[PDB]
Design a protein around this ligand. Structure first.
Ligand SMILES: [K+]
Ligand SMILES: [Mg+2]
Ligand SMILES: [Mg+2]
Ligand SMILES: [Mg+2]
Ligand SMILES: [Mg+2]
Ligand SMILES: [Mg+2]
Ligand SMILES: [Mg+2]
Ligand SMILES: [Mg+2]
Ligand SMILES: [Zn+2]
Lengths: 86, 56, 151, 51
RNA sequence: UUAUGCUAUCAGGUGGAUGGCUCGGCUCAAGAGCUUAUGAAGGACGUGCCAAGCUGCGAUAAGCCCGGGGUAGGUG
RNA sequence: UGGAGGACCGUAAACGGUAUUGAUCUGCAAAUCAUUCGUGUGACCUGCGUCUCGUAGUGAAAUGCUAAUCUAACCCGGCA
RNA sequence: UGUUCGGGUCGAAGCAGGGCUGUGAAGUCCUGUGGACCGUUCACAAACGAAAAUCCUGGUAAUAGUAGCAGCAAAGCAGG
RNA sequence: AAGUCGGCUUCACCCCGGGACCCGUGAAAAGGACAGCUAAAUGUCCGUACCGAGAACUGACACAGGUGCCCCUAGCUGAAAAGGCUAAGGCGUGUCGGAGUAAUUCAGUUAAGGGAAUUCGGCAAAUUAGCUCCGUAACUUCGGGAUAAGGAGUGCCUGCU
RNA sequence: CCCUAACUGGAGUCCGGUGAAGCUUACAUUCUAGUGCACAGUCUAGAGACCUCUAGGGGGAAGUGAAGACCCCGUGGAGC
RNA sequence: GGUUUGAUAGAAACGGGAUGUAAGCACCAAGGCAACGAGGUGUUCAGUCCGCGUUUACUAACCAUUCGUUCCUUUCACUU
């Protein structure tokens, strides 16, 4: 069951250094890496909600947001569940 | 248009068909002759002495 | 699930749609994977497991608003015209409509007794000669010259 | 959809059924001495000289 | 434990030389020497229980019939 | 009004091949690519069919073209 | 090849390395490996000796974990 | 599940008719029609899958060429089958990925002030650009030059002729 | 162009996978001069030089590609 | 360089900046019988944004590993 239920604002400015058409999956990778380091889990145990992925791809592959606010929950199995947050 | 690979894309036809008499794909579809065995030109089989060397 | 690609192709054939129009239930994947025949696909289609997604057309409403304004004579000025005057209104069609209107007007005037054959012939040749811009111009010439046999 | 006569299609059919591997029992019988034959081919290569 | 290397040998890998073997080839000699409309040679296609090639055979299709030789195995 | 012309503009329709002396130059390609260009109702372009060939043919003629071969093709033979 | 005299499964030819002899061409022996053939006298023959031919055929390096897997249509991501 | 109606337009398709041009005249033959109606029987043979091309063809290739763009193609903008944005249909295989950090390089965007001083040479790039109206020179074979040149306008909304 | 700068995408750079080719008698960390078939990394005398690796543009290797197509020669050709 | 004995990076807020006054709402709007109506004004130096700073341990600088011994050994300065 749940262990921690913290809300995060994940900055995505480092995503912008990548070539412009690669920015959306670079931002996906940044969100996953942020969750890995801040929740202290593995990359494969970080599950990204459809809200997060659809928000990162809203304006195309070249214009992801400069930040994203997410709600991540960690379980005893080590799995992390991340969803978009208001 | 280059004389090389470009003009080689127009190769969608044939000048020689399969020969009834000999089975070789040598029957000229225009001259109606087999260039291998002579079918469609002669009742005999096409043979020349220059098909081998002078036997000496 | 292994490939459901065979089922998707068969379902697009059975539904008569494109391959990507076919929707396979992501929850009923093993039910779909057991479907081998056209009858099985028809059963899945009838029970809603397989359906054809709605065609996303091209909406034409904002074109309708623009077309209404253009019918009123707006949104059609010189900064909107791109084709030559002649591609937007061909000249032979203009002449055809003009001369046909004039000739029909003259024919009806001769028929209903307002115009005798002598002046009808000359008016017909005048219309053929581009003397009148329209039916209104021809009527105005008739009334100014008093060529109509009024009673 | 080129149009073949009866004989041209028969020769194509013979070419097609020649393009089969040697049977496994032949390989067993010959003690791995006959494992292939010269009529193996692929359809997308130098074409047939048959039709 | 001085790496990257250099030289020689050894073990192994790769490779297919060498040797040995050979139902094949080549040359010479002696024989024998025409065949096909009674449809030849040649080719195509087919033909095997599992058979793709070659070989044989021809819808009687790796074969059918008769006589002789051979005799216990055969099914290229 | 009419609708002529080896008329005009123009298509990454089709045909051609100017310049970049660009890319490429063990290439995507034994001649291609991008951009820029010429023709685009006519001596037009093009499919299929058919004919004309080696001292011969074909050529609005460059010795161009005749199967990546052309101031005499290619194959075999003369030929060791 | 003719001819004389031999060796070999108690291990021939060949192969890798070594000892000895010979100015040398080379010969012989030893160890290992190998599994069936090999020499020798006097003579006679020849399709008889290779480091070279941008030699031929096969095998295999350096180059090098390098070039390429970009340019003409930059396409993938989440969840299952 | 509805499944009933109207209207507009109509290419690039069908029918029909006219005109113009030619020192160019634009195929032939089978077949068909003009007297056939009713019944029964017969209609053999070959092809037929699939690709038809940025992977099924051809160029040694899953080849940026060629064959074929050969014949077809929906909505808006627009003269348009241009270009752009979208359907349907086809795809994410014009079959390597990751990473985001140097120089250099292929292809682009922008650039003060100057404006061809560059260079063999304005090569390359930039400028202009649609449509409407005004206006248009030398010269001319009287046809043209000509879109010469040079000027003005252009969006949206409301109401109209 | 003065006189270049910044930025965009693709390469490159670094990582994983895949994976060739072309120069090569040998050796080789060179530099200067001389010498020598008079244009030397190797000869001579000096001067330098610890090795390995990476990136980088191309000074040199009279770099690589091609039995010079210019010239002459050949009692060699071809066409005209 | 910093690593809780901490402002290293990020969040939050604020400072300092970029742009130019968001959406919705109300009033006006040439006119239209009306429906509507480009647009103007107020709300509103608003809205959006910051690859700068500050404050602030809120999350992450945690948990380790490895060398500083030739390795096995008792060729031991050792310990079952
Ligand atoms: K079909
Ligand atoms: Mg040629
Ligand atoms: Mg002879
Ligand atoms: Mg034109
Ligand atoms: Mg010869
Ligand atoms: Mg040798
Ligand atoms: Mg890459
Ligand atoms: Mg002489
Ligand atoms: Zn023949």
């Amino acid at each position: 069951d749940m262990v921690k239920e913290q809300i995060y604002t994940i900055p995505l400015r480092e995503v912008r250094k990548v070539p412009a058409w690669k920015r959306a999956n670079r931002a996906v990778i940044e969100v996953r890496g942020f969750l890995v380091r801040h929740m202290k889990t593995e990359s494969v145990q970080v599950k990204l909600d459809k809200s997060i992925n659809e928000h990162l791809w809203e304006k195309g592959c070249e214009k992801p947001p400069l930040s994203i606010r997410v709600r991540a929950v960690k379980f005893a199995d080590g799995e992390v569940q991340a969803e978009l947050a208001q | 248009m280059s004389k090389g690979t470009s003009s080689m894309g127009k190769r969608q036809k044939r000048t020689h068909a399969k020969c009834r008499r000999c089975g070789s794909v040598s029957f000229n579809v225009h001259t109606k002759q087999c260039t291998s065995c002579g079918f469609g030109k002669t009742s005999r089989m096409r043979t020349y002495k220059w098909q081998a060397k002078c036997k000496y | 699930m292994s490939d459901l690609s065979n089922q998707r192709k068969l379902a697009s054939k059975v539904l008569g749609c494109g391959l990507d129009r076919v929707w396979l239930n992501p929850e009923a994947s093993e039910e779909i994977a057991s479907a081998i025949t056209r009858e099985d696909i028809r059963g899945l289609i009838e029970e809603g497991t397989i359906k054809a997604k709605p065609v996303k057309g091209v909406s034409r409403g904002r074109a309708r608003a623009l077309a209404a304004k253009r019918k009123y004579g707006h949104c059609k000025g010189h900064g909107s015209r791109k084709g030559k005057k002649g591609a937007r209104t061909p000249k032979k069609e203009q002449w055809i409509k003009k001369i046909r209107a004039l000739r029909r007007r003259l024919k009806e005037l001769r028929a209903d007794g307002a115009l005798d054959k002598s002046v009808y012939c000359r008016l017909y040749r005048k219309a053929k000669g581009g003397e009148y811009r329209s039916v209104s111009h021809l009527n105005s010439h008739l009334e100014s010259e008093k060529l109509l046999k009024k009673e | 959809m080129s149009h073949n006569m009866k004989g041209q299609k028969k020769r194509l059919a013979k070419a097609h059924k020649q393009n089969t591997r040697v049977p496994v029992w032949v390989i067993v019988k010959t003690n791995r001495k006959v494992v292939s034959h010269p009529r193996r081919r692929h359809w997308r290569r130098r074409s047939l000289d048959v039709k």
